Paper text:
Altogether CD38 appears to be a key player in the biosynthesis of calcium messengers which are involved in a wide range of cellular functions. Thus, the catalytic transformation of NAD+ involves the formation, via a ribooxocarbenium ion-like transition state, of a unique reaction intermediate that partitions between several competing pathways such as an irreversible hydrolytic process leading to ADP-ribose and a reversible minor pathway that governs the formation of cADPR. The L-shaped structure of bCD38 consists of two distinct domains separated by a cleft and connected by a hinge region. α-Helices are found mainly in the N-terminal and membrane-proximal domain of this transmembrane protein, whereas β-sheets are preponderant in the distal C-terminal domain. The active site of bCD38 consists in a funnel-shaped cavity with a fairly rigid structure; it buries the NMN+ moiety of the substrate and its scissile bond in its deepest non-polar and least solvent accessible region, whereas the AMP moiety interacts with its more solvent-exposed region, at the entrance of the catalytic cleft.
In agreement with observations on hCD38, incubation of crystals of wt bCD38 with rFNAD and aFNAD resulted in stable covalent intermediates whose structures could be resolved at high resolution. In both complexes, residue Glu218 was found covalently linked to the anomeric carbon C1′ of the fluorinated-ribose ring in an axial (α-anomeric) configuration. As in the Michaelis complex, the 2′-fluorine atom of rFNAD interacts with a conserved structural water molecule that is hydrogen bonded by the carbonyl and amide nitrogen backbone groups from residues Val116 and Leu137 respectively. Thus, although both copies of the enzyme contains a covalent adduct formed by reaction between the carboxylate of Glu218 and the C1′ of the N-ribose of rFNAD, the conformation of the covalently bound intermediates are quite different. In one copy of the enzyme (chain B), we were able to model the complete ADP-2′-deoxy-2′-fluororibosyl moiety in a folded conformation with the adenine ring stacked at full occupancy against Trp181. In the second copy of the enzyme (chain A), we were only able to model the 2′-deoxy-2′-fluororibose-diphosphate moiety of the covalently bound adduct. When the complete ligand could be observed it was found to adopt a ‘folded’ conformation. In contrast to the more extended conformation observed in the Michaelis complex with rFNAD where the adenine ring stacked against Trp168 (see above), through rotations around its C4′–C5′ and C5′–O5′ bonds the adenosine moiety has flipped over and the adenine ring is now stacked against residue Trp181, a position close to that previously occupied by the nicotinamide ring in the active site in the non-covalent Michaelis complex.
Numbering used by the authors: 41 to 277
Write the structure that this text describes.
């Protein structure tokens, strides 16, 4: 029925198993959380509904069970730097969205339902461009991203791509949802990191980063920007 790839096979089992692994072996001691209840809430958010009428409100109950809150001074944002940013966060024992409970559950997966049915659509799912932006996969990442940004505290870091013409993309989730909802008075450190021995194409003094700085000034968030670093110099530091 849709243009996008279908749901991850065995979605329900994958998320519950990821939840067990996360809560018991990845970030334990926190107060306890029921993984069966989390799985049930996640399914209830989208199953049997119109797959192109997802709203942020559909996810309030799921997120309340496990908000994407990272301890102060440990939070990492990224944009166009997925691989690098996660390497960095892993090495420094920091957390990206994909390191929160719900982000860990959902990372890399696909899901959508079908009206009337209680089952996943494993055959096809709304593509964001061809079908609808208001789909359950896209909306999940948006609302999770917003709460993650709102809960950030003290010093936060962002890894950006110094090999693009514009390291800051105002239409990205980081630019649209995260930066504009950053808790006021936190401090943000940006790292603009470039490839290989390929000379950077954007810097902290470029137009796009000046736009980011304007947003942060508006949030009363202090900004420090470092650039002209290759992947190795950034990670080795």
């Amino acid at each position: 029925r849709w243009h996008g790839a279908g749901s991850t096979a065995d979605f329900q089992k994958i998320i519950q198993e990821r939840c067990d692994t996360y809560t018991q072996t990845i970030r334990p001691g926190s107060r306890s959380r029921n993984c069966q209840a989390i799985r049930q809430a996640f399914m209830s958010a989208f199953i049997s509904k119109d797959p192109c009428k997802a709203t942020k409100e559909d996810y309030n109950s799921l997120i309340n069970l496990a908000p994407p809150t990272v301890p102060c001074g440990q939070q990492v944002f990224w944009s166009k730097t997925k691989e690098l940013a996660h390497e960095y966060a892993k090495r420094r024992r920091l957390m990206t969205l994909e390191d929160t409970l719900l982000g860990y559950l959902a990372d890399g997966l696909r899901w959508c339902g079908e009206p009337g049915s209680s089952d996943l659509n494993i055959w096809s799912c709304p593509d964001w461009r061809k079908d609808c932006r208001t789909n359950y996969l896209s909306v999940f990442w948006e609302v999770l991203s917003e709460r993650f940004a709102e809960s950030a505290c003290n010093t936060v870091r962002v890894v950006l791509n110094g090999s693009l013409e514009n390291a800051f993309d105002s239409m990205s989730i980081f630019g649209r949802v995260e930066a504009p909802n950053l808790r006021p008075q936190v401090e943000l450190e940006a790292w603009l990191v470039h490839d290989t021995g390929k000379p950077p194409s954007d810097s902290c003094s470029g137009s796009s980063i000046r736009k980011l700085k304007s947003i942060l000034d508006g949030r009363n968030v202090k900004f420090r920007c470092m650039d002209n670093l290759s992947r190795d110099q950034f990670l080795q530091r």
